[PDB]
Write a protein that binds this ligand. Structure first.
Ligand code: CL
Lengths: 195, 4, 116, 250, 231, 235, 244, 240, 243, 241
């Protein structure tokens, strides 16, 4: 099963996402990027049913990019998250719901604050200092409850996330083939190569 | 749900 | 109740129980029992006094004494024992509230106070 | 078949006039006089029962209509247009309010809904405007007593007192002199009967005059007892006898 | 005049001008002849070219193995009506295992044309058709007018100068009706009939179009050097 | 006003006859069919010298074996081309073969009279549809907004049509080579065009069985213009 | 058929104008004057009621100034009934945006939507356009205080100070003369009333013939208050500025 | 639904509603497009009949369709918004299905398609709008400038103008624009665009808007002072 | 003026001129008649022989509805066919629901309401036919005549088309000279005579006689065409009466 | 002047198509009369069979809408039958939905509301008919309610319709001015029909045979029409006093 973690530190949001794509007892890919850039300062990671995940992410990406062009303005992470929630909240009562869980990591330029949002396929939304979806969830929550602080630096955030992934590699019974880590700060969205 |  | 009020205004006539009865049964039948309403419909109109029962599937019946709900068998026992033709008002209230009491005491579904 | 009139029959003329709305107002002008007066403790609406034939039973034709227990309506212009508006007004009071909030709409919002129906007949495809002006008197807990006029355009205005139709210009002048902010309901009825006598030619009695009030709650007209908060309708139509009683003290 | 704006308007004398104008499109169309015996039914059509570089517009359309028509007027309207016949002939076969009677094919065309003369927005069909066929009651020739009027005939002609061919057939009636079990002689009589409607121009190899259906003859069209025999 | 599908007292559809006037105002297009192929040529007619002429696309590919030249309200042709391409590909999907040039033309012409009160008016553009199929070989069709289509050995449409058609009447024979047909299109275009014919204001194209439908380069057409000038100066 | 009686409300004149839009604008030119003035610290909306009566209930009356949400208000010029149709649409769009994004709608987005609806009635449907011009007074945290107008054409433009309805030519000249950029709300109130007082077709400008509204950051700290002036409050501001 | 055929043929084979739509464009404020060697510039007229305008919030004449394509127009402003919205949606729809931004030619062909559809659809009038669509195709350094009009015809232009007195500024460009050597730099290209507008505008104050689009989604709108420096330099050279 | 350009428009008279114009198309058509006999109805029609090329007895004008109702009309023949097609749908739906064949008065109103509907809207044209129809039901014989307005009544005899005045005169004599009634076989003979007499108004072109009948005794209350010997017997009687 | 072709207002605020529909009402040249007894409502109408070829039994302008409600029409028969079929349908639908027989005055209102729509919607023309509904209502007793193309309706003590309505109206007006009651004080409906016929004779100044009249009677729980013989008995009684 797929690991998607999020940690909001002092001045950024860091999203770790598992690189493996698996169907049954087959490993389809070992270098998958389970993320879309919604806007220059907003990143969404996603895990769930095949097709639904990408189809939903790309649909959300298109709608946010359209808003940006029309108003020549970037929607706040709070606004983007509310839009995404409402799209998932529609889908549950639809003929075939999107089975997608998402994390939304954004830097609000107006408030100069990093924001992390956890939304499940039902459209259940919460703002958290740290979040996770799937079996890895419970473990990472207990570990971050201990080590996490609000005033942590980006480097401190990465080390704590490094510890989570290390611990998950031992404890989890599936090979999730490592993670891709992406930081969201005032300067935008960049990928951490060394992990 | 409620239901005399 | 809303549609009966509009009908009363449209016709310039006080509404009739048979109208409410017809409108209720045709609605409940449309929904094939999925609207779980079991109603005892009573009233006075220019035609006279009327008492009907209507089940959730949209079947209706006429009677001098009716009971519905989980306590219907406790209530009917009292009604079958004590009812007679040509009841007075004071006798009918007594018999009615006695039939509810039977339900309140002997049925776990029924309880608290009696509304008349 | 099919309604192939999907286009507006009311358009702007080079002068900026909407012809059909003006012509509708002209139809209202030809119509019999009706008026409304607002007192401190009630509202009165009145009109003449212009009987088409003496063989006709004028009681059967209601020019003053109950919309809700606390809201009454009277008109000037085309009677049939009024009758269908009353039907639509009564229904929208239920569908767009009572079935949502579990209470009757306040006067101004029911007026707003009637106004909307009449604006649509002014813009929608293949229809002419309604050929009526309405006077709607009503009470509600938070606004108190109120009186509104509604025109074929869909425009509505609140009035202390006004008149519409045949002798409106004269009637409005008469009301301006008699109206004050300290009028009791009985005073307003007296002024309403005086004002209406000027615009009537023939017989002037309870059988030729239609008059209703929005006043105190009428528990005797509720039809049931046992719920303290239900005190009965504020709309009451005056009887033939009740009008004649007040014509002796005239 | 004031009553020719649309098909939904009668004139004060009870005339439908839009229908009469559609009838005019036919008279402008190139001549086509129809005639039958007891055994065979023949269509003969004079095809019209745009210029010397252009082809000669096809006049005869096959509807089934036992039925087809020739057209005079708007070709696109002939395509719509022929396509409708093809479907009705097809429906009759698939559902009832029954070859559609020529008389019933006429009744169906009539009813289709009529709807377009009583409804606003639409227009009448701008084409006349000569339907030939062999069914359970033998050989048949029908004339369709876009007014809706369909007529069963021994012979007829429609289009420009059609009156010449129609007069000839009216004289030859007793002769050509008796041409039984001789397809070539019935075509000869058809070619001699259409010849009464020619002026200046004569029948060439790429000009003449012939079709035949009969007792043991499926509806077949003859064009090019196949009709050189009859020139 | 009056119906859009109304017949005139002469038995013609007003709106169709009026669209035929719009086509007469259009830029010239010429088609010549031979046993070696079918040539299609157009006048580009740029409204200003600042207009990049190569962007003027009045010769259009429908399939590998069917080309198309247009004249009139050329904007109206986009949906006709779209339908033709779809018809050609769809038929290949259903039957695993090339669609007959006549069938493709018939499909385009079925749109023509789908107007009333469907689209609001007829098309204001005529098409020369050129192609090859195994059954009837090299073919040139004229598709009108009436829904009628004629096959032609050679045909001119647009402003210089009746002048060009009279020239094609004399010049066309059954033994024309492709090289001869190319020069003949250039010759008649140069005759009826307002501005002087060069490689930038006129465009050639052909359809052969071997190479299919090709729009000629400006460098290639330039050489055929130079070849024409020399052979006309030769007598 | 029915074609005979169709006015064709959505066609161009030979000059390339929209007949029904031009005639609708002619209609609006007869409506009571509405003025908007935008200051550094707030916005003013002033509007003249059309020849009132002594028997019109003024305190419960609203024909000119309407509330779209807590941050945005409109002044109306034209058919009141037509305006109410559009106002309820705008009120719903504002609440749809709030439901979706959990943020109050930016002023321009609401204005663009209403303007896009008006445009539609000029290009398709064959219905008459809305005989309404709006002055939008609003605040958001992107552009701050904003004044816009829309007209039956569906065109909208931004303004420092603008008038719609009657005598706009005269009104716009007076505003263009006395308006400065560093101007404050109290000054903008005085300008709005002085402008109406000079352009009015009435003998004198009184409290019973006016609707007045301000959108102020004059709300305790970092927030925005809408004030729809009561009859007695309009009477007070008329004495203060020295018009009565 | 309202089905009435508003765009129909006349006896002389003209569609008057489409031609009257071009008259709306003629009335619209002047718009000019000039492509240099490595850039395209979109100049636009702002009629100075409207002062007391808030230039911060007033809809700007040049609209971004994507990060790499811009659309300016002449004619009915309200009509232009409907084309811009449709174009912006199609731009995102193309990125979503083709995994590549639209070419300038493709976006033009789409907008032109929409304009055409509104000339033979029941119940609708043509768009009273002509557009100039300019930009650079993905991973391409070749400048692109296209024009559309109510009829739905579109074509590529070295340089082009539309709107009121476009005849005059087209005259200027036809003699002043050399194809063999187009404006080499951004400066040269902006200067020629400002010069072309000064033939028509009136005052070189807040009446001229300039937008410079460079390759790889590099789009910037010049300020009042930046444009005023071009206006100053042009007239100082003219005094000779 | 202009009140006659659109269908469903009342003139200042209170008339629908488009319907009155439809009547002109009817007056222009060939003669058709109906005769109500003792236990049934007889229908006859004039078929103009335009050309020798017309196949005799092939272009049948009289139409059956269900199995017991005969329909004949004068005016626009296609409009007649359209009305009968609807009649067959109405008769089918009635029999489907109520089991019994549609009674004639019931069937009459089905056509009546349909024809009247084509006078309510400007989007449709009135019917260009007068339709004579009838047959035998449980309550006996019924003859009806239906005009473009949607007006219909029961008739002892009916006539419409170019020779209607001539026919109406001959029908009025039979009613006077046979109060006790007329037999089915007599009515066939008389029908033939009345068409031949009414042909004086279409005397230019020679014609072809076509008769049908529904009789309780002669056809078992079913609609049948008069053919062979009985048709020739009626033609002979008719030819003898004009000479 | 297209404001005279469809149902839109004229500058005078008038609907000409409604006014011209009223004129179509008299096209038949037939006069109808309706009166109320104690226990009954009687409606009489002139019957004119100009053609000898017509089956006189099928020539009627009186319709049995429901068992209780009768309707006489003044206007052309096509529009009359259109109105008849709709009223029959409406009366049946009402009984099914609300579980009691549609009252006379409620059907009148419903048909009047339909008439109003034709005066407001352009694509529908008004029907050129005046509908007179009669019954013995179980609440209101003997009832006369009349509808017109404008969508107007009202109750009547008595009424008359047709070319000579004003002559019949004044004749009835003058009778009720004497008696000072809203009905005919008569036990049997037979004598109320005799009154109706007698007062029409006096008003029109014409004598009637059995085939010249058409009578409809409403009693409690049925409305029925009289045969030629039933009318002959009525005419004999009138003559013998
Ligand atoms: Cl109703």
């Amino acid at each position: 099963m797929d690991i998607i973690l999020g940690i909001r530190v002092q001045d950024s949001v860091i999203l770790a996402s598992s690189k493996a794509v698996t169907r049954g007892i087959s490993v389809l890919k070992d270098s998958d990027d389970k993320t879309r850039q919604l806007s220059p300062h907003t990143l969404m990671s996603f895990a769930g049913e095949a097709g639904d995940t990408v189809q939903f992410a790309e649909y959300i990406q298109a709608n946010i990019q359209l808003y940006s062009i029309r108003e020549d303005y970037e929607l706040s992470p709070q606004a983007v998250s509310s839009f995404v929630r409402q799209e998932l909240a529609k889908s549950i009562r639809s003929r075939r719901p999107y089975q997608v869980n998402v994390l939304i990591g954004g830097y609000d330029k107006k408030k100069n604050k990093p924001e992390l949002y956890q939304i499940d396929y039902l459209g259940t939304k919460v703002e958290l200092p740290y979040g996770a979806h799937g079996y890895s969830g419970f473990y990472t929550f207990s570990l971050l409850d201990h080590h996490y602080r609000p005033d942590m630096t980006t480097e401190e955030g990465l080390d704590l996330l490094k510890l989570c992934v290390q611990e998950l590699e031992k404890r989890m019974p599936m090979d999730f083939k490592g993670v891709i880590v992406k930081i969201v700060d005032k300067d935008g969205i960049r990928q951490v190569d060394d992990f | 749900x409620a239901y005399x | 109740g809303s549609n009966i009020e509009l009908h009363s205004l449209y016709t310039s006539r006080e509404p009739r129980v048979v109208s409410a009865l017809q409108m209720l049964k045709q609605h409940l039948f449309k929904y094939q029992g999925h609207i779980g309403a079991y109603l005892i419909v009573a009233g006075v109109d220019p035609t006279g006094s009327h008492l009907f029962s209507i089940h959730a599937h949209g079947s209706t019946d006429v009677g001098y004494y009716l009971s519905l709900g989980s306590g219907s068998l406790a209530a009917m026992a009292v009604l079958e024992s004590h009812w007679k033709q040509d009841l007075t008002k004071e006798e009918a209230i007594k018999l009615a509230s006695d039939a509810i009491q039977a339900g309140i005491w002997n049925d776990l579904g029924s309880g608290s106070n009696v509304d008349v | 078949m099919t309604d192939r009139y999907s286009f507006s029959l009311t358009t702007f003329s080079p002068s900026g006039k909407l012809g059909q709305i003006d012509y509708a107002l002209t139809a209202v002008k030809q119509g019999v006089t009706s008026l409304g007066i607002k007192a401190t403790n009630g509202v009165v609406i009145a009109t003449e029962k212009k009987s088409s034939s003496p063989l006709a039973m004028s009681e059967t034709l209601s020019k003053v209509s109950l919309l809700t227990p606390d809201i009454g309506a009277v008109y000037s212009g085309m009677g049939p247009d009024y009758r269908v508006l009353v039907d639509k007004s009564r229904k929208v009071a239920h569908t767009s309010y009572k079935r949502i909030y579990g209470e009757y709409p306040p006067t101004k919002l029911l007026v707003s809904e009637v106004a909307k129906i009449m604006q649509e007949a002014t813009q929608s495809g293949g229809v002419r405007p309604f050929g009526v002006s309405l006077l709607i008197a009503g009470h509600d807990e938070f606004n108190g007593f109120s009186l509104y006029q509604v025109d074929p355009s869909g425009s509505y205005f609140p009035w202390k007192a006004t008149a519409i139709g045949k002798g409106s210009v004269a009637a409005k002048t008469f009301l301006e002199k008699r109206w004050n902010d300290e009028l009791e309901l009985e005073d307003a009825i007296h002024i309403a009967l005086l004002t209406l006598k000027e615009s009537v030619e023939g017989e002037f009695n309870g059988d030729t005059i239609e008059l209703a009030i929005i006043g105190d709650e009428n528990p005797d007209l509720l039809g049931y007892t046992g719920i303290p908060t239900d005190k009965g309708p504020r709309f009451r139509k005056l009887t033939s006898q009740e009008i004649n009683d007040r014509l002796e003290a005239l | 005049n004031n009553y020719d704006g649309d098909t939904v308007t009668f004139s004060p004398t009870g005339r439908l001008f839009q229908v009469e104008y559609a009838l005019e499109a036919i008279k402008q169309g190139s001549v086509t002849v129809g005639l039958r015996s007891n055994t065979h039914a023949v269509l003969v059509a004079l095809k019209r070219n745009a210029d010397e570089l252009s082809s000669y517009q096809k006049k005869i359309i096959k509807c089934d193995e036992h039925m087809g028509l020739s057209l005079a007027g708007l070709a696109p309207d002939a395509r719509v009506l022929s396509n409708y016949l093809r479907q009705q002939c097809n429906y009759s076969s698939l559902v009832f295992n029954r070859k559609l009677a020529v008389e019933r094919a006429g009744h169906l065309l009539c009813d289709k044309a009529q709807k377009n003369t009583q409804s606003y927005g639409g227009r009448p069909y701008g084409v006349g058709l000569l339907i030939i066929g062999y069914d359970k009651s033998g050989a048949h020739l029908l004339e369709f007018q876009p007014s809706g009027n369909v007529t069963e005939l021994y012979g007829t002609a429609i289009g420009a100068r059609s009156q010449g061919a129609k007069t000839y057939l009216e004289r030859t009636l007793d002769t050509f009706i008796k041409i039984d079990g001789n397809p070539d002689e019935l075509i000869k009589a058809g070619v001699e009939a259409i010849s009464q409607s020619l002026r200046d121009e004569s029948l060439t190899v790429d000009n003449l179009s012939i079709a035949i259906v009969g007792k043991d003859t499926p509806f077949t069209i003859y064009d090019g050097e196949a009709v050189a025999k009859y020139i | 006003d009056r119906g859009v599908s109304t017949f005139s007292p002469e038995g013609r559809l007003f709106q169709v006859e009026y669209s035929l006037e719009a086509i007469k105002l259009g830029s010239t297009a010429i088609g010549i069919a031979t046993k070696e192929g079918v040539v299609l040529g157009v006048e580009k007619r740029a409204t200003s010298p600042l207009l990049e002429s190569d962007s003027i696309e009045k010769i259009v590919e429908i399939d590998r074996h069917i080309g198309c030249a247009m004249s009139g309200l050329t904007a109206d042709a986009r949906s006709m081309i779209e339908h033709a391409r779809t018809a050609a590909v769809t038929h290949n999907l259903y039957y695993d073969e090339d669609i007959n040039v006549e069938s493709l033309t018939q499909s385009v012409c079925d749109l023509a009279l789908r107007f009333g009160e469907l689209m609001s008016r007829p098309f204001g553009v005529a098409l020369l549809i050129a192609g090859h199929d195994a059954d009837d070989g090299y073919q040139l069709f004229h598709a009108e907004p009436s829904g009628t289509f004629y096959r032609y050995n050679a045909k001119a449409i647009g402003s210089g049509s009746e002048g060009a058609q009279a020239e094609l009447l004399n010049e066309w024979h059954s033994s024309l080579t492709l090289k001869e047909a190319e020069l003949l299109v250039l010759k008649i275009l140069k005759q009826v065009m307002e501005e002087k014919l060069d490689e930038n204001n006129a465009q050639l194209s052909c359809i052969t069985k071997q190479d299919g439908f090709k729009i000629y380069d400006n460098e290639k057409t330039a050489e055929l213009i130079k070849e024409l000038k020399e052979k006309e100066a030769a007598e | 058929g029915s074609r005979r009686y169709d006015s064709r409300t959505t066609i161009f004149s030979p000059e390339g104008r929209l007949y029904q839009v031009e005639y609708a604008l002619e209609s609006i030119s007869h409506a009571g004057t509405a003025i908007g003035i935008m200051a550094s610290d707030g916005i003013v909306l002033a509007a003249e009621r059309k020849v009132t009566s002594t028997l019109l209930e003024q305190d419960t009356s609203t024909e000119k100034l309407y509330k779209l949400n807590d941050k945005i208000a409109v002044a109306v010029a034209g058919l009141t009934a037509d305006a109410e149709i559009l106002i309820n649409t705008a009120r719903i769009h504002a609440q749809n945006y709030l439901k979706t994004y959990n943020e109050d709608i930016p002023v321009e987005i609401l204005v663009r939507r209403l303007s896009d609806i008006k445009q539609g009635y000029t290009q398709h449907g064959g219905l008459r356009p809305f005989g309404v011009s709006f002055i939008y007074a609003g605040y958001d945290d992107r552009y701050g205080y904003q004044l816009y107008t829309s007209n039956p054409s569906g065109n909208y433009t931004g303004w420092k100070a603008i008038s719609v309805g009657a005598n706009t030519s005269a009104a716009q000249t007076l505003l263009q003369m006395d308006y400065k950029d560093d101007m404050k709300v109290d000054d903008a109130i005085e300008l709005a009333l002085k402008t109406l007082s000079k352009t009015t077709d009435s003998s004198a400008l009184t409290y019973d013939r006016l609707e007045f509204a301000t959108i102020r950051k004059g709300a305790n700290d970092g927030e925005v208050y809408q004030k729809i002036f009561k009859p007695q409050e309009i009477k007070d501001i008329l004495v203060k500025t020295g018009i009565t | 639904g309202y089905d009435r055929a508003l765009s129909i043929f006349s006896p002389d084979g003209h569609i008057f509603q489409v031609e009257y739509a071009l008259e709306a464009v003629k009335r619209g404020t002047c718009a000019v497009g000039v492509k240099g060697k490595n850039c395209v510039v979109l100049g636009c007229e702002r009629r100075s009949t409207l002062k007391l305008q808030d230039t911060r919030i007033t809809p700007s004449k040049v609209s971004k369709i994507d990060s790499h394509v811009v659309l300016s127009f002449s004619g009915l402003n309200a009509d232009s918004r409907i084309l811009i919205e449709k174009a912006r949606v199609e731009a995102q729809s193309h990125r979503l299905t083709l995994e590549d931004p639209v070419t300038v030619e493709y976006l033009t062909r789409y907008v032109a398609g929409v304009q055409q559809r509104y000339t033979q659809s029941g119940g609708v009038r043509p768009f009273g709008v002509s557009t100039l669509i300019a930009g650079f195709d993905p991973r391409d350094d070749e400048p692109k400038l296209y024009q559309t009009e109510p009829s739905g015809i579109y074509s590529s232009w070295s340089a082009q103008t539309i709107g009121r007195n476009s005849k005059t500024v087209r005259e200027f460009l036809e003699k002043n624009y050399d194809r063999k050597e187009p404006p080499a730099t951004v400066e040269e290209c902006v200067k020629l665009t400002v010069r072309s507008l000064l033939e028509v505008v009136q005052t070189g104050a807040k009446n001229i808007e300039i937008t410079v689009v460079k390759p790889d989604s590099d789009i910037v709108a010049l300020s009042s002072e930046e444009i005023n420096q071009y206006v100053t330099q042009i007239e100082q050279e003219k005094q000779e | 003026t202009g009140y006659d350009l659109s269908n469903s428009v009342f003139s200042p008279d209170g008339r629908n001129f488009q319907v009155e114009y439809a009547v002109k198309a009817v007056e222009n058509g060939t003669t058709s008649i109906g005769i109500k006999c003792n236990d049934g109805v007889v229908f006859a029609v004039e078929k103009l022989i335009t050309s020798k090329l017309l196949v005799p007895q092939k272009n049948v004008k009289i139409q059956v509805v269900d199995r017991h109702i005969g329909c004949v009309y004068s005016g626009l023949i296609p409009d007649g066919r359209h009305l009968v097609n609807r009649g067959r749908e109405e008769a089918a739906s009635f029999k489907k629901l109520y089991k019994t064949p549609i009674p004639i008065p019931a069937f009459a109103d089905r056509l009546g309401q349909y024809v009247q509907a084509h006078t309510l809207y400007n989007s449709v044209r009135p019917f260009g036919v007068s339709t004579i129809f009838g047959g035998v039901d449980k309550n006996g014989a019924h003859l009806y005549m239906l005009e473009p307005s949607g007006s219909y009544w029961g008739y002892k005899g009916a006539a419409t088309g170019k020779g209607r005045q001539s026919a109406k005169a001959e029908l009025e004599k039979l009613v006077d000279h046979h109060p006790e009634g007329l037999s089915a076989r007599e009515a066939v003979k008389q029908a033939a005579k009345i068409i031949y007499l009414a042909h004086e108004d279409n005397k230019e072109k020679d014609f072809e006689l076509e008769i049908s009948w529904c009789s309780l005794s002669e056809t078992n209350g079913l609609h049948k065409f008069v053919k062979g010997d009985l048709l020739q017997e009626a033609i002979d009687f008719a030819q003898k009466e004009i000479n | 002047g297209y404001d005279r072709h469809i149902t839109i207002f004229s500058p005078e605020g008038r609907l000409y198509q409604v006014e011209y529909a009223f004129k179509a009402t008299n096209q038949t040249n037939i006069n109808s009369l309706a009166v109320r007894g104690k226990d009954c409502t009687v409606v009489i109408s002139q019957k004119k069979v100009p053609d000898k070829l017509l089956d006189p039994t099928t020539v009627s302008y009186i319709f049995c809408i429901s068992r209780t409600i009768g309707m006489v029409v003044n206007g052309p028969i096509p529009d009359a039958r259109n109105a008849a079929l709709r009223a029959k349908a409406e009366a049946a639908e009402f009984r099914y939905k609300y579980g009691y027989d549609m009252p006379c005055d409620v059907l009148a209102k419903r048909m009047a509301n339909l008439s109003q729509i034709y005066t407001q919607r352009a694509y529908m023309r008004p029907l050129g008919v005046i509908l007179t509904f009669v019954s013995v209502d179980e609440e209101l007793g003997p009832s006369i309610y009349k509808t017109d193309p404008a969508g107007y309706y009202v109750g009547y003590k008595a009424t008359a319709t047709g070319p000579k309505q004003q002559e019949i109206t004044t004749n009835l007006e003058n009778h009720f001015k004497k008696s000072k009651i809203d009905h005919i004080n008569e036990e049997s409906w037979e004598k109320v029909v005799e009154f109706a016929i007698t007062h029409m004779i006096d008003a029109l100044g014409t004598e009637f045979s059995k085939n010249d009249l058409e009578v409809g009677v409403a009693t409690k729980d049925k409305f029925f029409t009289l045969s030629a013989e039933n009318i002959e008995e009525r005419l004999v009684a009138i003559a013998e006093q």
